[PDB]
Structures are given as structure tokens and as C-alpha cells.
A paper describes a structure:
Molybdenum, which predominantly occurs as the oxyanion molybdate (MoO42−; henceforth MoO), is imported via the high-affinity ATP-binding cassette (ABC) permease, ModABC in P. aeruginosa. Pseudomonas aeruginosa PAO1 ModA has a non-contiguous dual-hinged bilobal structure with a single metal-binding site positioned between the two domains.
Metal binding results in a 22° relative rotation of the two lobes with the oxyanions coordinated by four residues, that contribute six hydrogen bonds, distinct from ModA orthologues that feature an additional oxyanion-binding residue. Analysis of 485 Pseudomonas ModA sequences revealed conservation of the metal-binding residues and β-sheet structural elements, highlighting their contribution to protein structure and function.
Author numbering: 23 to 251
The structure:
Amino acid sequence: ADEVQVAVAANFTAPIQAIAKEFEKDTGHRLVAAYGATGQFYTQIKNGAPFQVFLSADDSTPAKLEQEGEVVPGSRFTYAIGTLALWSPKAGYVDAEGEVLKSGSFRHLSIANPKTAPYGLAATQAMDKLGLAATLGPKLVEGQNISQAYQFVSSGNAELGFVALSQIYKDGKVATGSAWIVPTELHDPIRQDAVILNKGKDNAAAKALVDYLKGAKAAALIKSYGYEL
Ligand SMILES: [N+]
């Protein structure tokens, strides 16, 4: 039973580690994961990489690799859908329906740059749908990615941030601080897509992993880590 080398967006580290234990216990395939930012794997796969499967934190980068013939054509699918959360490390700062955001009664709001970060785009889409973009604009602090957006609500001076639910979840619930989980109607789906790389075209272990991700056991872990299927 061969191993499968997988490139995993760091957003998805904890779930793939849990999936890997079950995947190996149930199939004998050993899962060898590298973790990093989506763009780091994009540059590597373009330049030549050993992976047979790539789990992106977006859907545009797998699609670009397909357009470039660098991964198996037709292999792209959505393995997880991210969830956007309004979060503070302060207990009880964020009320259950997010009225703290909707009032505008706060000093700074941390977000990711929408041009490059899917969880940043979700935030700006939600603010636009609520009519809050212009009046909250002066309070925004923008980071390059969702990791920076989350860190700033902790080590920087923002009381609120639009973060990935997966950043604040443990064991199926928000682990610390306080959050408002943004309804799906307020933004486009935060699709996280996977592809099989040219190297994995005829690799049974690659196909087994990708289909395992589409199964019921994987779905249950994925939900508990803060995603939708
Ligand atoms: N929706």
C-alpha cells in the first residue's frame, strides 16, 4: 500500500492530520503532508514538485494550475467550504448575532485583503451586503492573509476581526473569546479546492485519498474543525 504525498494549505493542518490517522488505519496508505501557504505550493508545483494531491485554501489557484497543464485535467473539486466568523479574544465582547459589528461601536476591525484572501473577500462581501463598507471603512485594518487578520485581533490593537472559523474552533465549538458566525447568505462560498497533480494521475493512493475526502467519515471530521461540506 503506497504512500501519498499531499500539499496542504496551512489553514487545513489540523483536519488533515486527523484524517490522515483514519485514512492510514483504514486503507494502509501512509499520508505524507507538507503544510504551507497556497501561493507557496502554487510556485512550487509550477517549478516542479513531488506531490500527488494539492489541498488549496482557495479555488482559483487549483483552477489556474489546471489551466497551466501542471496538474491532472478535470480533477478539481471542493473538499471543504470555509466559514467566516466575527471574533474577539475578549469573552462576551461579541454578542450572539453580531450586533457589536452592526452598530459600529468599536475602534478597529481586522480583515484580510480581499484581492488575494478568500476569507477577506467573504468579509468585504458581507459588509457590502449589510451596507457597512463605507461607514466602517475608517476602522478597517487590512492584512495580507487570514493568518495576519487573526493575529492582529490578538497581538495588535483590533478588538474585532473577520477570521476563519477554523482558526478559532476546537472540538466543534469556538474555543476561546467570543464570535458571531456569519450566515452563508452574506457572501459567496469560501471554496477550498483540491486537485490531483500530474504525478498522481495513475496513482491509486492519490485517488483513494481524494475519494476518502468525499466520504462520510471525512465529512464528520471536517465539520468539527469549523467547515461546511
Ligand atoms: N447561502
